[PDB]
Design a protein around this ligand. Structure first.
Ligand SMILES: Nc1ncnc2c1ncn2[C@@H]1O[C@H](CSCC[C@H](N)C(=O)O)[C@@H](O)[C@H]1O
Ligand SMILES: [Zn+2]
Lengths: 300, 351, 179
């Protein structure tokens, strides 16, 4: 529980869109809506390259399992596909009628889920880029989706309090996570086994739901998450820490064993919207929006 | 489960001759009139890979025990082991130019059984160019369909005269032999020998347009020269309906058979074996090939390049979208009440 | 785009149909065949004659894709057959919960509610010049709310009847009173 600040990955010109680690655990790269996907290192913040070649801003970039192929959820309503290795304009894939906010991958690295603001979860192809299907998801735009341990399920983060665990192959609603409240569900993800649900509803309270049973077990107190779609994570490299972004210029990292305030990290000057965990070692991604533009290497 | 309606098609490649799913059912190779190595993906319903191989219609295709090696048989006796990585030739020598079947041993991709048209079935090793010819009693039929079982124990060699002859995969042991007649006039030309995926319940297609279900366990119980009765006789009721191809389900539970006349296809089970649905089609279409998928109700229907697919029995309802909605069937009157008014540290990464 | 925290988030709707598209004599109910044959035909064919799609009239509706004939059966309004004083309890309850109340009756003894238990007949809008009505039938001692047609109802026409309150009917015979 002694994550120490190491370096600063300075250079961003707008609000940092995302800070996620590469699947090799060796490239904590980043991006923003300035058409500058700034590929940085992981241990010192060494510059590698910068992806450009869009029309409008960039919402989301997601990691393929070879740490190389990057799809861009760019705000020109395209799915422009780029590369850590080359950076060629591989496939520009239009189609969504509204802003493609988030994008993720199956663990098989052959599908492009597309969580856009157009209320239709369409699926796209890695090799060529055909609109594979179109999920009648919600009467709300999509903020976050995820696949399970293989890619057979799609969880939804709707805005009227619905987390429908969608099928992927046949593609129908299998289970709707029900709530009498209708909170704006921000960032859902499956557990790394695929059998538990962390529904990040915007009520200053994270919710760990079971997938088999379906009831909540543990929550968290004393954190500020109401407005932005603040990302949450899972960390087992040190303790059982839960890494999340902040709004009062902190780095929200607490334990499922504790559920309360036991460790805080600090130094940002804006709302931290994106956080991530190193899969093996104790490196934690922390970078805020436009009033910070810096990425802070916390390291135990 | 049992596929019902139209579902469209993937007619991306014409002149389609044969089609084969891999060990998991998840890949697909179609040799065509030119005989190319054309590969698909199924959830995308897209083409995976196209490799040109030859010019001839490649008839026989089979995957491997890992689902990563292949085999081919064109008109010019080209019988090599093929691959899914590069797909390159290994062996090629003389056979009679009509070739029916090659068949890997289901526990060894060394032992392969080559079945020509009017020749004895010949078992080849794939370590080298060795070949072992299985014995034929008649030598007047010259049409003895043979197949390994699902496990790898025995070879079931049956002539055109309804005579069964079982051989062991290495020592040719006649542990069982019999013959069948029904509505007894004479024997019947054996159309095909089949095998399921779960167990040993299997069937025989015969030229009387009647399909008789069997089981190798009672065959080995009677051993040689018993009277094995069929588990179930399957046929057409109103008409003749001559058959081109039959197949099990992905475990051997449903049994769906393809007619050779009408392009309107018939579905049965194994246990009951009821005609549950006639899958219709265009009358002006010639059915040529049928394939089935293990964990999905795919009907791969090659009809002269047209590969059309019918895949259903999934009908959407409510209470998964809105689980508060309790869909009654008829009018349910009731009163629900007889009086109308902890810290377990649970692992989240438990793999 | 990650900075403008926008409104228009919660919908207060238990069903979520609002997709991108929402694509809106032989039969016994038109024959002189008896009422048990018509009622057995009704449950098997209301599942396959009509469909629920998003309604520009109000909410989500019942948009048929078939030339529905005149005077024949269309759909059966089946749901919670609750007592007449459980009506007021569930009205207070779904006033406290926001789910729309669906209480059409057979008589003044028990009223069919359509909130928990229901069918596609929940999605029937009101036109003051409708294309259907209803008649109380008698099957096997039970009574059934059966929506009988009026004219040839074309492909794409949403289905409405007389309920007997300003409406979105769009008709010029409008009562604006449904009490
Ligand atoms: N034609 C119409 N115009 C205005 N309100 C109507 C109407 N028809 C029915 N209503 C009222 O509106 C409610 C329908 S709920 C609206 C439809 C559906 N629940 C949906 O949105 O998906 C009913 O309680 C009914 O009393
Ligand atoms: Zn009106």
């Amino acid at each position: 529980p002694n994550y120490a600040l190491k370096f600063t990955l300075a250079g961003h010109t707008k609000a940092v869109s995302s800070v996620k680690f590469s699947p090799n655990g060796e490239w904590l790269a980043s991006s923003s809506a300035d058409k500058l996907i700034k590929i940085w290192g992981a241990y010192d913040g060494k510059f590698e390259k910068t992806i450009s070649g869009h029309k409008l801003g960039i919402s989301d970039v997601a990691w393929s399992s070879d740490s190389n192929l990057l799809v861009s959820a760019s705000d020109d309503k395209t799915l422009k596909i780029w590369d850590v290795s080359s950076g060629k304009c591989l496939k520009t894939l239009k189609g969504h009628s509204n802003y493609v906010f988030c994008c993720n991958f199956n663990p098989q690295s052959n599908l492009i889920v597309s969580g856009s603001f157009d209320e239709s979860v369409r699926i796209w192809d890695v090799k060529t880029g055909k609109c594979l299907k179109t999920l009648p998801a919600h009467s709300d735009p999509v903020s976050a989706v995820h696949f399970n341990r293989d890619g057979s399920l799609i969880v939804s983060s709707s805005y009227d309090g619905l987390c429908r665990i969608w099928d992927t192959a046949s593609g129908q609603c299998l289970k709707t996570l029900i709530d009498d409240d209708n909170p704006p569900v921000s960032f859902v993800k499956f557990s790394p086994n695929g059998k538990y649900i962390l529904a990040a509803t915007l009520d200053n309270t994270l919710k760990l739901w079971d997938y088999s049973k379906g009831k909540c077990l543990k929550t968290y107190t004393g954190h500020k998450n109401e407005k932005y779609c603040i990302f949450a994570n899972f960390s087992v490299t040190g303790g059982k820490w839960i890494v999340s972004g902040s709004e009062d210029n902190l780095v929200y990292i607490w334990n499922l064993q504790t559920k309360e305030i036991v460790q805080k990290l600090q130094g940002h000057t804006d709302v931290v919207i994106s956080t991530a965990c190193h899969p093996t070692e104790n490196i934690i991604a922390s970078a805020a929006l436009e009033n910070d533009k810096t990425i802070k290497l916390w390291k135990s | 489960n049992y596929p019902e309606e139209a579902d469209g098609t993937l007619d991306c490649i014409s002149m389609a001759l044969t089609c084969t799913f891999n060990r998991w059912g998840t890949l697909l190779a179609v040799g065509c009139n030119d005989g190319r190595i054309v590969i698909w993906d199924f959830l995308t319903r897209g083409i995976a890979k196209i490799i040109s191989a030859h010019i001839h219609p490649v008839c026989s295709l089979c995957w491997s025990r890992d689902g990563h090696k292949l085999v081919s048989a064109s008109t010019d006796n080209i019988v090599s082991q093929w691959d899914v990585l590069s797909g390159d030739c290994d062996q090629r020598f003389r056979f009679p130019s009509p070739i029916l079947k090659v068949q890997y041993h289901p526990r060894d991709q060394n032992k392969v059984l080559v079945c020509p048209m009017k020749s004895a079935p010949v078992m080849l090793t794939l370590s080298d160019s060795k070949h072992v010819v299985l014995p034929v009693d008649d030598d007047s039929d010259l049409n003895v369909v043979a197949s390994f079982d699902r496990r790898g124990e025995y070879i079931y060699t049956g002539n055109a005269k309804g005579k069964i002859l079982v051989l062991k995969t290495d020592s040719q042991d006649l542990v069982a032999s019999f013959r069948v007649t029904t509505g007894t006039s004479n024997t019947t030309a054996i159309k095909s020998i089949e095998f399921a995926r779960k167990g040993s319940c299997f069937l025989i297609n015969t030229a009387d347009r009647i399909i008789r279900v069997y089981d190798g366990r009672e065959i080995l119980t009677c051993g040689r020269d018993g009277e094995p009765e069929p588990m179930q006789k399957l046929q057409d009721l109103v008409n003749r309906t001559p058959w081109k191809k039959c197949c099990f389900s992905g475990d051997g539970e449903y049994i769906v058979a393809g007619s050779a006349r009408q392009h309107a296809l018939y579905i049965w089970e194994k246990s009951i074996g009821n005609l549950v649905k006639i899958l219709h089609g265009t009358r002006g279409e010639l059915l040529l090939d049928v394939a089935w998928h293990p964990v999905r109700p795919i009907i791969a229907s090659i009809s002269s390049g047209v590969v059309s697919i019918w895949a259903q029995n999934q009908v959407e309802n409510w209470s998964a979208f809105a689980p508060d909605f309790k869909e009654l069937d008829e009018n349910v009157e009731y009163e629900e009440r007889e009086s109308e008014f902890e810290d377990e540290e649970v692992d989240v990464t438990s793999v | 785009a990650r900075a403008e925290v926008h409104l228009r988030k919660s919908a207060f709707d238990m069903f979520n149909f609002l997709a991108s598209k929402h694509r809106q004599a032989r039969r016994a109910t038109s024959m002189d065949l008896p009422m048990p044959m018509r009622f057995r035909h009704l449950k098997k064919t209301s599942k396959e004659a009509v469909g629920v799609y998003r309604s520009p009239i109000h909410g989500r509706g019942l948009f048929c894709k078939r030339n529905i004939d005149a005077g024949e059966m269309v759909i059966e309004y089946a749901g919670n057959v609750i007592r007449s004083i459980q009506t007021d309890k569930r009205e207070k309850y779904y006033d406290s919960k926001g789910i729309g109340c669906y209480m059409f009756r057979i008589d003044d003894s028990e009223v069919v509610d359509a909130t928990m238990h229901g069918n596609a007949a929940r999605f029937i809008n009101h036109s003051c010049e409708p294309n259907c009505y209803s008649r109380v039938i008698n099957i096997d001692g039970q009574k059934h709310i059966v929506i009988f047609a009026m004219r040839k109802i074309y492909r794409g026409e949403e289905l409405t009847y007389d309920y007997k309150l300003p409406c979105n009917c769009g008709a010029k015979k409008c009562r604006k009173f449904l009490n």
